[PDB]
Amino acid sequence: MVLEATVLVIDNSEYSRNGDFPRTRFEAQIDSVEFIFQAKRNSNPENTVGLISGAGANPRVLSTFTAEFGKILAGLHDTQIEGKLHMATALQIAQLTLKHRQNKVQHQRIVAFVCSPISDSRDELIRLAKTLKKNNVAVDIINFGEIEQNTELLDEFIAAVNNPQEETSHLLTVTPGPRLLYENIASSPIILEEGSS
Amino acid sequence: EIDTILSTLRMEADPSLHPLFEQFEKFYEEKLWFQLSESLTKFFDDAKSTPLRLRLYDNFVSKFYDKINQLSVVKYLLASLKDSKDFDESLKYLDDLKAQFQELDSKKQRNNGSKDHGDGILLIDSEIARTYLLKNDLVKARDLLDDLEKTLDKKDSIPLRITNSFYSTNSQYFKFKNDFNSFYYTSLLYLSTLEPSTSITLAERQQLAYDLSISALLGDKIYNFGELLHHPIMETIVNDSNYDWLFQLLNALTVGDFDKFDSLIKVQISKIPILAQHESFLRQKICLMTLIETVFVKNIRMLSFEDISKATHLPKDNVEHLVMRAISLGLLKGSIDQVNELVTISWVQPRIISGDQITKMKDRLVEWNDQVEKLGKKMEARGQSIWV
Amino acid sequence: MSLQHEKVTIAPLVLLSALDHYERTQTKENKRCVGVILGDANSSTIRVTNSFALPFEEDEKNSDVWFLDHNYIENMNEMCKKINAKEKLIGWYHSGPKLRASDLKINELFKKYTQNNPLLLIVDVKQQGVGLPTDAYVAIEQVKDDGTSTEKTFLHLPCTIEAEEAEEIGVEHLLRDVRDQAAGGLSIRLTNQLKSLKGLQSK
């Protein structure tokens, strides 16, 4: 997607600690933010990306929209490693951040890392799913947390969001064993994502 | 390699805790260090007093310090070493982990971004001081406690746990000395910042509560008899055998009944020889309590000596001693006129405000509302000409 | 951090700024405007000298959900110091109406930037009554005798107003009233005695 403003959600939960992905899953995501940043920029040099956390009780703004990978990276150094994901507040704040744009043309996209099963209720996520498609904002889920012990709740939410429409949602489920986290996202659609209209 | 150590724990362990040991290793295998953490916590509740906890747990922590968050590890190592009988073992294992940390933070801070390594330091220092109290090296334990206090309080946003350990150490020191005054206030703080974890055994929780009550009887300025009952520490267990005679003495003091104090005291002074050696302190508290109560609720700020004498069941000779003792303690301030036989109070020390009393305040204020109001009317009316 | 927050003296310019900026950032109907307050501290008496608006977008539904552009605050700040480098970030104005316990979280953000505890100066813009439309509150974390395992809280602080020489002369040039807080002649003070009684009564 040419012309895109992306909010990344970094989860810094007690499940990112765990050594599941090389070296640790927590340290893997650092590499993953840098790789994503360069992929997006080379697609269309006028794209930008920002980084919010979902971790902690209250999502904390690290970095707003920037074309610069070091800034985002500086922001990654501030982190709480005892936070707990709270998706419901993260999505809502994320949209807001996206409504201010350098140019109005750039689409509204969330790519969110999800490392822990979503503690919020099923009923909440049903309301959230239709809140998102209403304002033309789609959410692309990097999953490898919820598969661990819980059924893919996230799938029903993605299906409602996806309609024939330029904005398309996807559920991307990542081989959980070693194969390098950044590599899986690399061999998946990330800018080869097509429309649905 | 650690498989074999597990086999050893399994054997000596009860069959009930036998499935636990296999699961611990399973979580470790998979490298689910979230589950690994939790499994440990549970183990230690009821198996802290079996020699398997420290051993197995210790080994696990040593072979997985980095793997689990640092805070978890450090709480484990203290628990094992509370239960040691050797003070020499405890001292050594603690100085090794502190040492390790110094190297650890160089790496970690850059690898994570932000990992807090300061937690572990203060927790260690508190337990090291606690080891020393045991060997009666009471002078050392003191000055390490001072050093820490200054440090801790400069650290701006403190976690609850750190100052909670600081407070256990502190109290203890003072009750070796058996100064009641010193023990009591500090103890109240320990309880307030007390971990919501129920990992601290009910037996330990009551035992400490007991101590506060004994100090408070034998003190000289403590009137928090009501405060204890409004705090959880006593609030939740009120049925125990110990909590008969004991609560009853406290309610005896509050209402200033000397007949109720007398009857109890005959029995109790025998049971506990502490109260025998502080017989004089215990006798005084009932009297002090009663004079201040009467002065508070009475709205007039002068009271004749005759009222106090009959109220307190003491001769009139003893009234002059008691008012004098009181002004000196600073419980009350005022003056003694022997030629009007009045004692004029001019200051009363803050007190709890019981339910009944909340109602009283409202009454005094309702009356004062009407005074303001009636006055304002006349003055509104007269001198109408000019208000500009 | 700084415990030192014994008194709050407040510039009338701050007020004035908080009232005006509210409309030129164009927020109405309980949509909060958050801006920075600049002035001195590490001093017993805290003196709030001046202020500047930040953009602030607040979600209608909840007060746990909000947008604040962090990066803006640092960029604004450095130009502002060139003007006057005495001034330091000391906290934030909240455009009323009235305290929330959602502020506790908000305060914490500002604390990152500041080397002192951020002051929450609630400048109420609705000007209810003729009494001061400032309450001041500071986030303090304290222990409490009830049993509570450390409480985090906002404690009321005394608010007064002081103005500079430059500022004071501006206040008097503007005013054209006869005045009646003068407490001057027999007439003003005659009123003032009655006024105080009823003042008390209401309270």
Swiss-Prot record, chain A:
Keyword Ubl conjugation: yes
Transmembrane intervals: none
GO cellular component: cytosol; nucleus; proteasome complex; proteasome regulatory particle, base subcomplex
Entry comment on modification after translation: Ubiquitinated, leading to its degradation. Ubiquitination is promoted by HUL5.
Residue ranges of every copy of the VWFA domain listed in the record: 5-190
BP-aspect Gene Ontology terms: proteasome assembly; proteasome-mediated ubiquitin-dependent protein catabolic process; ubiquitin-dependent protein catabolic process
Disruption phenotype: Cells are viable.
GO molecular function terms noted in the UniProt entry: K48-linked polyubiquitin modification-dependent protein binding; polyubiquitin modification-dependent protein binding
Keyword entries, A-Z: Proteasome, Ubl conjugation
Keyword Ubl conjugation: yes
Similarity comment text for this entry: Belongs to the proteasome subunit S5A family.
UniProt function note: Multiubiquitin binding protein.
Further information: Present with 17200 molecules/cell in log phase SD medium.
Complex and partners: The 26S proteasome is composed of a core protease, known as the 20S proteasome, capped at one or both ends by the 19S regulatory complex (RC). The RC is composed of at least 18 different subunits in two subcomplexes, the base and the lid, which form the portions proximal and distal to the 20S proteolytic core, respectively.
Full protein name: 26S proteasome regulatory subunit RPN10
Species of the source: Saccharomyces cerevisiae (strain ATCC 204508 / S288c) (Baker's yeast)
UniProtKB/Swiss-Prot annotation, chain B:
Keywords assigned by UniProt, alphabetized: Proteasome
Domain (PCI): residue spans on this chain: 182-350
Cellular compartments per GO CC: cytosol; nucleus; proteasome complex; proteasome regulatory particle, lid subcomplex; proteasome storage granule
Keyword Flavoprotein found: no
Top-level taxon of the source organism: Eukaryota
Entry-linked Pfam families: PCI, PSD13_N, Rpn9_C
One BP term from GO: proteasome-mediated ubiquitin-dependent protein catabolic process
InterPro entries referenced in this protein's UniProt entry, alphabetically: PCI_dom, PSD13_N, PSMD13, Rpn9_C, WH_DNA-bd_sf
Coiled-coil annotated residue ranges, if any: none
GO MF annotation list: structural molecule activity
Other known facts: Present with 12400 molecules/cell in log phase SD medium.
Assigned protein family: Belongs to the proteasome subunit S11 family.
Described purpose of this protein according to its UniProt entry: Acts as a regulatory subunit of the 26S proteasome which is involved in the ATP-dependent degradation of ubiquitinated proteins.
Identification of the protein by name: 26S proteasome regulatory subunit RPN9
Organism: Saccharomyces cerevisiae (strain ATCC 204508 / S288c)
Name of the gene this protein is made from: RPN9
From Swiss-Prot, chain C:
PTMs per UniProt: N-acetylated by NAT1.
GO BP field: proteasome-mediated ubiquitin-dependent protein catabolic process; ubiquitin-dependent protein catabolic process
Coiled-coil boundaries: none
UniProt keyword annotation of rRNA-binding present: no
GO cellular component term, pick one: proteasome complex
Modified residues (N-acetylserine): 2
Record has Endoplasmic reticulum as a keyword: no
Domain MPN: 8-143
GO MF: metallopeptidase activity
Keywords, in A-Z order: Acetylation, Phosphoprotein, Proteasome
Family note: Belongs to the peptidase M67A family.
Note: Present with 19800 molecules/cell in log phase SD medium.
Role description: Acts as a regulatory subunit of the 26S proteasome which is involved in the ATP-dependent degradation of ubiquitinated proteins.
Protein's name according to its UniProt entry: 26S proteasome regulatory subunit RPN8
Included stretch of the parent chain: 1 to 203 of 338
